[PDB]
Design a protein around this ligand. Structure first.
Ligand SMILES: *[C@H](O)[C@H](C[C@@H]1CCNC1=O)NC(=O)[C@H](CC(C)C)NC(=O)c1cc2ccccc2[nH]1
Ligand SMILES: *[C@H](O)[C@H](C[C@@H]1CCNC1=O)NC(=O)[C@H](CC(C)C)NC(=O)c1cc2ccccc2[nH]1
Lengths: 306, 306
């Protein structure tokens, strides 16, 4: 029993982190096979960062300009290219610790583990969700760029995120491993807006199911509702609209608990309309939206990887 | 910027987890050098667990009764002993992945990372605090026993916790790596009480400092207070009393932020007396007590390990 925000074990990713230095800027890169991947803004001076012409800046660079260090060892750069907002450095040595991996672009509302790194050394791990507005609520300081987000499926690491930026609102933005930003952001030193941060309704419902499974049922009420009526409440509270595919997703959880999705929608409606009256659910005084249905199932049925 | 519950990278510990089977009971063991450590209740039948005589039960066991599997490989048990509530199995093979390690017994209020495991395979990692009442608020199912808690200091893994039990209240109990329980608990299948769960006052203050550092300052008030007066509020709210050593601990954070500890105590007093008025601090509608001063500093100054 019990329900916690849980990250994937981080050992397969730890072995892939390197340090990348160009001039004075140091950040993290990901070393898979004979390629190191890092944020292209590593080539920027403090001045360049305001309005960079990355193509011109990259032109002035040669292989030997890039110091790629994996521990106390220097890798030899034999090639470089820019892909969207990521730099790919070709090196002469395949990473002997390369795990089975793929690059994926995750959808809003999905979760992943971040391995927060500095100077190519892992610092810590935590779980994040890609918000509907394509930001994450992380913990990142200067030096953290190039830290990656990932899921583990079997023995296969799916990399989905590389860290680039912090927004004025204190949230975080970055790219997939092909260098395309999640959301509207650009890699330039300007204050940028993510827009309204809507709540991941399906995730909240998953978490309510988790609560029930774990014996917290006080918020269950006598009422039911309809999708359209529920959503008419959702919209008001900046909740993502609930689709029928969302209902299909929640199906196993509904089935395991004996509680209809629309009944749970009704209980949620009351919580939105009434708040929680200074009570808690799974130790929180707020509705939590950063667990997927999958996350709930896996944690409530003790799934593993290796 | 940003502040998250963060675990240590788990790679050095992943390589130390094995599976231990005796009869039908399977759980996790920790494989360091030529010794595997696991909960002694692995030797129990469902019946035995009610009122076990571990010495008698262990007598009926021989080396060959213990199946220790590290991946698809069986280790050879050449010796067994009981130390308090932990079994030590001597095996013929030193773990080639043994990290630099020590066993420590942590104090109430300190944090550690849990690597939650099933069948000797890591499932996930999260941060916990040892509560004043010697429990932790984890996520553990049947099969999780033998999962370990740890800190990383440099390249040295300090193991501090092994999982044994879930209490009626849904919290968790276990031992140090010498097999002495944290708290009053015993390894028998009886409902056991942890007693009043007091709040780690010094940790709450650390977290308020973290909030300030991160720009959330709304709860700062115009007032100051004294230790004795503050504590007279603490006691009422089941907060651990604040000592002067606690003040010394918070010294750097006070110093970095320009906010006196007793001023912060005053702000805390108002929050205890007034609540939060449906506002949040670092994304929480509750006062958080599972970050140490050290945790705050390290996360706010990006400390690393490898
Ligand atoms: C890379 O390590 C670093 C990560 C951030 C530093 C603080 N927290 C972080 O997550 N990224 C940057 O420093 C980037 C670099 C640009 C060129 C992509 N800049 C920003 O995050 C940035 C610039 C800026 C300007 C106004 C308001 C916010 C803001 N954020
Ligand atoms: C070991 O994997 C297992 C871990 C718990 C199962 C559910 N969640 C857990 O964290 N530990 C046990 O099953 C132990 C075994 C005893 C012999 C030490 N038993 C309990 O946790 C237990 C027994 C019991 C009886 C009444 C109320 C609570 C309670 N918990």
């Amino acid at each position: 029993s019990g329900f916690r925000k849980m990250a994937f074990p981080s050992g397969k990713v730890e072995g892939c982190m390197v340090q990348v230095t160009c001039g004075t800027t140091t950040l993290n890169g990901l070393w898979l096979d004979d390629v190191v991947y890092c944020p292209r803004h590593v080539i920027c001076t403090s001045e360049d960062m305001l309005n960079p012409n990355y193509e011109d800046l990259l032109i002035r660079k040669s292989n030997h300009n890039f110091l790629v260090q994996a521990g106390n060892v220097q890798l030899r750069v034999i090639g470089h290219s820019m892909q969207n907002c990521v730099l790919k450095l070709k090196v002469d040595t395949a990473n002997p610790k390369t795990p089975k991996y793929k690059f994926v672009r995750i959808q809003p509302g999905q979760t992943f583990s971040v391995l927060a790194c500095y100077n190519g050394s892992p610092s810590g791990v935590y779980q994040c969700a890609m918000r509907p507005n394509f930001t994450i609520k992380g913990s990142f300081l200067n030096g953290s760029c190039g830290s990656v987000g990932f899921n583990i499926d079997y023995d296969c690491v799916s990399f989905c995120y590389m860290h680039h930026m912090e927004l004025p609102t204190g949230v975080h933005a970055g790219t997939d491993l092909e260098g395309n930003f999640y959301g509207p952001f650009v890699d330039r030193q300007t204050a940028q807006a993510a827009g309204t941060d809507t709540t991941i309704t399906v995730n909240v419902l998953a978490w309510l199911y988790a609560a029930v499974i774990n014996g917290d049922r006080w918020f269950l009420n006598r009422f039911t509702t309809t999708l359209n009526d529920f959503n008419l409440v959702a919209m008001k509270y900046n909740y993502e609209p609930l689709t029928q595919d969302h209902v299909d997703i929640l199906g196993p959880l509904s089935a395991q608990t004996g509680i209809a999705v629309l009944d749970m929608c009704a209980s949620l409606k009351e919580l939105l309309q009434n708040g929680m009256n200074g009570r808690t659910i799974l130790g929180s005084a707020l509705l939590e939206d950063e667990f997927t249905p999958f996350d709930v199932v896996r944690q409530c049925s003790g799934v593993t990887f290796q």
